[PDB]
Amino acid sequence: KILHRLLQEG
Amino acid sequence: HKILHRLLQEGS
Amino acid sequence: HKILHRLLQEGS
Amino acid sequence: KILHRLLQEG
Amino acid sequence: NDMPVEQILEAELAVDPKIDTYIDAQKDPVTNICQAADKQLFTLVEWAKRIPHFTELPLEDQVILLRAGWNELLIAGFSHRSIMAKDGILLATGLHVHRSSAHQAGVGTIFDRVLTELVAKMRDMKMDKTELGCLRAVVLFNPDAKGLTAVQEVEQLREKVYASLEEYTKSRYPEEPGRFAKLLLRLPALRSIGLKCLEHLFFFKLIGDQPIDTFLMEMLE
Amino acid sequence: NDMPVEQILEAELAVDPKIDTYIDAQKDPVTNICQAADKQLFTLVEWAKRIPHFTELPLEDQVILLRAGWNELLIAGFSHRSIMAKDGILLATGLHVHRSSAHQAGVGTIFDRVLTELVAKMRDMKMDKTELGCLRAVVLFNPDAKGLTAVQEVEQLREKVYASLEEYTKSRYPEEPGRFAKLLLRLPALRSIGLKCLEHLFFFKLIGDQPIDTFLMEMLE
Amino acid sequence: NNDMPVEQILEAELAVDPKIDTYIDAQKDPVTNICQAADKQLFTLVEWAKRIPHFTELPLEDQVILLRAGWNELLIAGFSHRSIMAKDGILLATGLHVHRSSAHQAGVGTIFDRVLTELVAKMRDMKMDKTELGCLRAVVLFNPDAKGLTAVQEVEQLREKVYASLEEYTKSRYPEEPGRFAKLLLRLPALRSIGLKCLEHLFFFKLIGDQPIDTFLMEMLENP
Amino acid sequence: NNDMPVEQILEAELAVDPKIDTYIDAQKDPVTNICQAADKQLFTLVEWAKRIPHFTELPLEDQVILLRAGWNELLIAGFSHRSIMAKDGILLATGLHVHRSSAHQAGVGTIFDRVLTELVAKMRDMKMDKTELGCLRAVVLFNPDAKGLTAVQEVEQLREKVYASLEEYTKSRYPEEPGRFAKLLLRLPALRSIGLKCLEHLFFFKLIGDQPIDTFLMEMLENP
Numbered sequence: 022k023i024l025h026r027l028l029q030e031g
Numbered sequence: 032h033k034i035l036h037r038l039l040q041e042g043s
Numbered sequence: 044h045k046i047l048h049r050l051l052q053e054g055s
Numbered sequence: 056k057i058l059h060r061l062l063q064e065g
Numbered sequence: 066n067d068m069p070v071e072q073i074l075e076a077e078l079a080v081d082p083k084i085d086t087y088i089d090a091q092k093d094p095v096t097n098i099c100q101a102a103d104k105q106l107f108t109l110v111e112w113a114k115r116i117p118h119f120t121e122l123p124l125e126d127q128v129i130l131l132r133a134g135w136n137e138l139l140i141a142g143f144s145h146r147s148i149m150a151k152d153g154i155l156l157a158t159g160l161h162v163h164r165s166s167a168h169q170a171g172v173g174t175i176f177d178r179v180l181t182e183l184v185a186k187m188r189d190m191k192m193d194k195t196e197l198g199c200l201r202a203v204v205l206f207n208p209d210a211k212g213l214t215a216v217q218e219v220e221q222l223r224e225k226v227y228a229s230l231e232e233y234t235k236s237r238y239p240e241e242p243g244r245f246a247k248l249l250l251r252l253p254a255l256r257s258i259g260l261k262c263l264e265h266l267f268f269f270k271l272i273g274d275q276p277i278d279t280f281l282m283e284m285l286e
Numbered sequence: 287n288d289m290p291v292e293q294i295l296e297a298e299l300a301v302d303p304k305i306d307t308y309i310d311a312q313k314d315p316v317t318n319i320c321q322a323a324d325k326q327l328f329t330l331v332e333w334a335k336r337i338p339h340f341t342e343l344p345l346e347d348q349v350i351l352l353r354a355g356w357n358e359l360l361i362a363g364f365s366h367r368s369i370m371a372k373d374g375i376l377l378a379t380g381l382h383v384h385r386s387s388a389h390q391a392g393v394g395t396i397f398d399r400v401l402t403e404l405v406a407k408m409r410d411m412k413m414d415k416t417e418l419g420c421l422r423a424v425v426l427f428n429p430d431a432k433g434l435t436a437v438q439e440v441e442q443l444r445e446k447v448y449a450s451l452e453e454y455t456k457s458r459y460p461e462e463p464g465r466f467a468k469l470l471l472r473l474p475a476l477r478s479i480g481l482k483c484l485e486h487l488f489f490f491k492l493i494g495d496q497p498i499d500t501f502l503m504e505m506l507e
Numbered sequence: 508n509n510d511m512p513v514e515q516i517l518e519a520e521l522a523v524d525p526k527i528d529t530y531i532d533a534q535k536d537p538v539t540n541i542c543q544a545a546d547k548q549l550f551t552l553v554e555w556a557k558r559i560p561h562f563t564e565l566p567l568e569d570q571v572i573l574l575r576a577g578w579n580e581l582l583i584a585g586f587s588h589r590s591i592m593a594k595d596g597i598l599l600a601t602g603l604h605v606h607r608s609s610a611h612q613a614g615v616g617t618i619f620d621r622v623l624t625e626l627v628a629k630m631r632d633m634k635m636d637k638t639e640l641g642c643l644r645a646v647v648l649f650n651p652d653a654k655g656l657t658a659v660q661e662v663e664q665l666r667e668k669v670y671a672s673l674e675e676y677t678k679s680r681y682p683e684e685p686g687r688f689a690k691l692l693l694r695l696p697a698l699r700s701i702g703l704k705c706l707e708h709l710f711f712f713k714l715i716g717d718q719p720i721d722t723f724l725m726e727m728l729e730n731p
Numbered sequence: 732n733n734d735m736p737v738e739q740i741l742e743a744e745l746a747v748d749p750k751i752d753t754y755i756d757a758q759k760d761p762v763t764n765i766c767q768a769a770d771k772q773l774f775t776l777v778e779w780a781k782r783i784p785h786f787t788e789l790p791l792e793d794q795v796i797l798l799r800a801g802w803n804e805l806l807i808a809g810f811s812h813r814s815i816m817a818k819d820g821i822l823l824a825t826g827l828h829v830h831r832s833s834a835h836q837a838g839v840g841t842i843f844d845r846v847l848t849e850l851v852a853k854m855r856d857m858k859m860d861k862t863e864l865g866c867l868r869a870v871v872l873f874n875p876d877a878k879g880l881t882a883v884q885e886v887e888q889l890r891e892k893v894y895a896s897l898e899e900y901t902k903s904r905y906p907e908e909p910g911r912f913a914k915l916l917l918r919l920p921a922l923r924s925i926g927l928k929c930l931e932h933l934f935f936f937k938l939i940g941d942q943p944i945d946t947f948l949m950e951m952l953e954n955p
């Protein structure tokens with residue numbers, strides 16, 4: 022989604 | 032069903 | 044608001 | 056879930 | 066032949082509402098849509114009376130078909146009309162109901178289904194009045210409807226309708242081999258949205274059975 | 287002190303419904319729940335009149351508080367009562383409304399929220415009548431409510447209530463340092479479910495504004 | 508013609524055909540019988556889907572969406588068709604036969620009769636074969652109206668391909684009957700209606716909390 | 732006491748504090764201003780969450796559920812608190828100041844005043860600090876009532892830990908005020924009320940189709 026994106030590259 | 036019956040008789 | 048006012052006067 | 060499970064080992 | 070698409074086109078044309086502009090409502094959309102429906106029910110009968118052979122079915126069957134079909138018949142009708150709106154539906158009373166009113170009034174979710182699964186697809190393929198009239202006729206000729214006497218008669222009438230539709234379609238749109246399928250494949254969505262509307266309507270009818278008691282009314286003002 | 291938990295307990299006890307068995311209804315659950323509400327509104331006032339200091343607020347504020355608080359006050363009440371049911375709520379009219387009726391009647395989703403976020407948690411921690419009365423008092427003393435005159439007065443009353451609650455809690459449940467928090471942290475859910483109910487109620491009130499026209503009624507029977 | 512060969516859809520139906528030649532009539536509580544058969548068939552249903560051309564190239568979140576939106580009509584279509592071999596009853600994948608009298612006694616008679624008269628009898632009278640059944644199911648599977656699809660176009664398009672292959676198969680295998688393709692597609696609205704009404708019965712048996720229901724079925728009734 | 736050190740929550744608030752010392756009052760259309768600031772803050776909001784102890788040990792499908800359920804109250808709490816520094820206005824992370832007169836002219840005055848009187852003024856009057864703000868936000872984040880959580884217990888439990896640390900910090904940093912902990916938690920119901928009403932305004936601006944809205948914000952309004 023974008024949220025998933027953001028939460029994985031962490 | 033009064034309304035539908037009545038309407039089905041009239042046209043023709 | 045008639046019902047709430049009236050009820051708020053009565054008890055005491 | 057179970058459905059995911061089932062759909063991946065394919 | 067015997068089930069001519071031209072007379073089916075006639076039947077649709079004869080029931081377009083005579084229609085000005087279309088003002089909004091945002092005020093009681095649900096009410097407005099139910100009034101439009103009641104209003105269109107009268108004209109639904111006249112439409113049916115004009116579909117070939119319909120009135121030569123037994124009287125009893127003519128009423129079963131219309132009691133079984135109306136909601137899907139009315140949904141198909143306003144959906145096809147509403148193609149020229151963006152995100153709204155156009156009622157026969159000349160009112161336009163916006164998607165934003167529909168969510169505000171609590172029916173957002175079934176409304177969206179009408180826009181996405183009916184209106185938008187009717188629009189993307191430019192379904193014409195002839196295809197719509199045929200689809201409605203197929204729905205009107207529902208040989209599954211309970212209690213029918215002339216079962217086999219309705220079956221033959223529906224078979225007629227779709228043969229003429231396929232015919233009309235192959236010839237008016239020969240660039241589109243899938244068109245006929247694509248049209249029939251909208252009927253499941255119609256069926257489905259039809260059922261969800263009736264739930265809505267049964268719920269409003271029981272609500273309206275019984276006013277709110279007077280103190281509760283007072284807290285709501 | 288000055289805001290004693292004992293009198294708060296008294297106020298709750300004085301308004302338990304005098305209660306037999308609890309028969310189902312499955313028939314018009316929404317109606318039944320709205321009648322129970324109307325009924326409890328009368329007793330809600332008496333409850334309030336018995337919360338210390340409430341009646342020494344200006345009359346005007348007493349009405350603002352109760353117009354602002356009732357729905358959350360009534361939801362908290364039936365939720366706490368309903369702890370002994372499994373998946374249902376117990377109305378003050380002695381009716382039990384099953385989760386399965388609530389979905390059938392179209393309010394399944396807010397109903398489930400009541401069970402999960404209120405009833406089940408009230409049950410898991412065994413919230414007692416004293417904690418419930420305090421929580422309701424805190425809600426009754428809402429210093430954010432619009433148009434209040436004695437703002438600061440309500441603020442002081444709510445501050446009292448929660449100090450006595452914390453006190454009651456630390457002493458009746460000293461095995462549970464988190465208990466007081468856990469109780470206050472149910473108020474957001476209450477707030478939220480309260481708002482969703484009022485939407486429901488406004489929608490039924492407009493439905494009921496206007497019957498269904500007569501042909502439409504006839505298609506629904 | 509295209510990229511959606513009916514042999515492969517037929518290969519799909521046949522790989523999941525529970526091969527059953529003797530049934531036991533089951534007068535006990537049919538609802539539990541039907542639930543267990545449905546749980547059981549959910550597992551085959553996924554195997555079935557994975558064997559449908561291009562299904563498994565779809566965004567995974569889309570495979571899940573389709574199966575979760577289509578399971579109830581898909582399984583209804585399955586046992587309605589196996590059931591053409593019974594008379595007034597349905598035939599479960601678990602080897603049980605449930606008679607209509609027994610559905611009536613258990614208070615689900617009406618929806619039961621709707622399956623007999625709208626699906627089974629029609630499928631039997633037009634001698635719907637396994638190829639057409641698979642296509643119909645594949646059409647139902649590739650449902651581009653399902654909420655939350657990310658690849659809507661790919662789904663639409665795979666739909667179109669199934670119904671192009673169906674139609675061509677039909678024209679070739681049954682040229683006596685030029686209406687056959689339409690007759691097939693026109694069973695889908697009943698399929699949709701009856702699928703909604705069964706899901707309503709199920710969801711309600713689940714909410715009453717009494718009626719058993721196993722675990723894949725349960726995951727489905729939580730997924731809708 | 733436990734496993735949820737407030738230093739680390741405070742470290743979290745400070746890492747996302749947009750450091751801003753001069754604002755421009757924005758009388759133009761405030762709604763677009765607020766939307767863009769919200770889009771902008773959604774990105775920091777995720778950075779913020781990832782820095783909350785144990786957040787990133789949660790089932791991933793749970794991180795998503797929490798952020799998607801908590802974003803609107805989380806961001807409201809953020810700018811309400813930065814805004815204690817204004818008077819009758821709010822201060823956006825984008826450097827704009829929106830005055831209440833201007834919210835009124837744009838027809839969102841009522842919810843605007845609710846933020847001033849129920850959140851900003853209270854936060855200012857009790858001198859809520861950044862530590863308490865972070866805890867409140869962490870409490871809101873670890874919302875065990877969110878639909879679809881798989882690790883409910885882990886969430887509950889992390890909630891409990893935040894509010895245990897909060898309470899102990901409060902007792903120690905503000906022993907003058909024994910009610911402070913309660914005063915903090917009692918701002919959450921208003922936070923919840925005002926969050927619902929803003930989401931209603933947003934969803935409605937989205938459905939009207941006119942009002943701009945960027946892309947992370949849009950993904951949120953499609954996620955609810």
Ligand SMILES: CC1=C(/C=C/C(C)=C\C=C\C(C)=C\C(=O)O)C(C)(C)CCC1
Pocket residue numbers: 095098099101102105136139140142143155156157158172175176179261262263265266
């Ligand atoms: C879709 C819909 C509803 C029902 C509409 C039906 C069943 C008939 C409307 C026909 C019209 C509006 C006729 C016309 O103007 O041609 C209800 C009321 C449940 C509310 C939400 C949206």
Ligand SMILES: CC1=C(/C=C/C(C)=C\C=C\C(C)=C\C(=O)O)C(C)(C)CCC1
Pocket residue numbers: 316319320322323326357360361363364376377378379393396397400482483484486487
């Ligand atoms: C929760 C709920 C609803 C509203 C209930 C409210 C706001 C008051 C009920 C109080 C009772 C039932 C009093 C008592 O018996 O103590 C409505 C009607 C929207 C329908 C769905 C479930």
Ligand SMILES: CC1=C(/C=C/C(C)=C\C=C\C(C)=C\C(=O)O)C(C)(C)CCC1
Pocket residue numbers: 538541542544545548579582583585586598599600601615618619704705706708709
């Ligand atoms: C039809 C029917 C029901 C639902 C069945 C469904 C949703 C699928 C059945 C799966 C089978 C029977 C699989 C197979 O046998 O291949 C319920 C429970 C409402 C009881 C009434 C009759």
Ligand SMILES: CC1=C(/C=C/C(C)=C\C=C\C(C)=C\C(=O)O)C(C)(C)CCC1
Pocket residue numbers: 762765766768769772803806807809810822823824825839842843928929930932933
């Ligand atoms: C409050 C408010 C609205 C919603 C704001 C929301 C949901 C979050 C704002 C984020 C900001 C402003 C982030 C930051 O500045 O840190 C709407 C759009 C209803 C307009 C009325 C006032």
